Amino acid sequence: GSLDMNAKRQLYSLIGYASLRLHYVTVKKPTAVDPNSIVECRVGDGTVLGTGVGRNIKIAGIRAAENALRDKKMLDFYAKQRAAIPRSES
RNA sequence: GGGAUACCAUGUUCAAGUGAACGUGGUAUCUC
C-alpha cells in the first residue's frame, strides 16, 4: 500500500459525496534544508482523522491520505453513511 | 551538475476498483 493512487481512490472514490465534505489543510514551517508538511484530513462535521506530517509537501499529501486509509473500517462506515443518508437536512 | 521547498504557465499519465498526483519550462534560496 502506502501509495497516492490507492489513497485518493479510497478517500475520494470510496468516500466523499454530494453531501458532507471533508478537506485537507496543510500547515508547516518549510525550510530550505529542514522541510516539514502536516495535513489535516477533517470532515464537515469537524472530524479530523487523516493527519499526515512528512518531511516534504508530497509525503504530507500522500501521508495524510494514507493515515485515513488506515481506518478502512471507518471509510466503509462512512460509505454506508453517505448512502444511508435520508437525502435531507431538517 | 545531482537534489528540495516555494511560485507561475501548462501538460502527461496512472489506476481501471474509479478518482487523483506528479512531471516539465523558467526565477529564487538553500544544499550536496
The CATH number of residue A64's host domain is 3.30.160.20
Chain A 42..61 CB hits on strand B (< 7 A): 56-58, 61
Cβ of residue A21 lies below 7 Å from strand B = no
Contact by Cβ (8 Å): A7, A66: yes
CB-facing half-sphere around the CA of A39: CA atoms within 13 A = 21
Q: Look at the block and give the residue holding cell 495535513.
A: A39
Q: Confirm if A37 and A22 have CB atoms less than 8 A apart.
A: no
How far is it, in rounded angstroms, from Cα A6 to Cα A81? 21
Of A32, A75, A42, A40, residue with least CA distance to A60: A40
The residue that minimises its CA distance to C1' of B18 is: A13
Residue entry with cell 466523499: A16
Question: From which experimental method does this structure derive?
Answer: NMR
Which residue range forms the structural domain that includes residue A46?
A: 1-90
Q: Which three cell numbers stand for residue A3?
A: 501509495
A72 touches strand B (CB under 7 A): no
Residue A30 near residue A36 (C-beta atoms within 8 A): yes
Number of domains chain A is built from: 1
Nearest residue to A24 via CA among A10, A43, A3, A4: A43
C-alpha span between A69 and A65 (Å, rounded):
6
A22-27 and A47-54: which strand pairing? unpaired
* Chain B bases having any atom below 7 Å from a protein CB: 3-6, 14-15, 17-23, 29-32
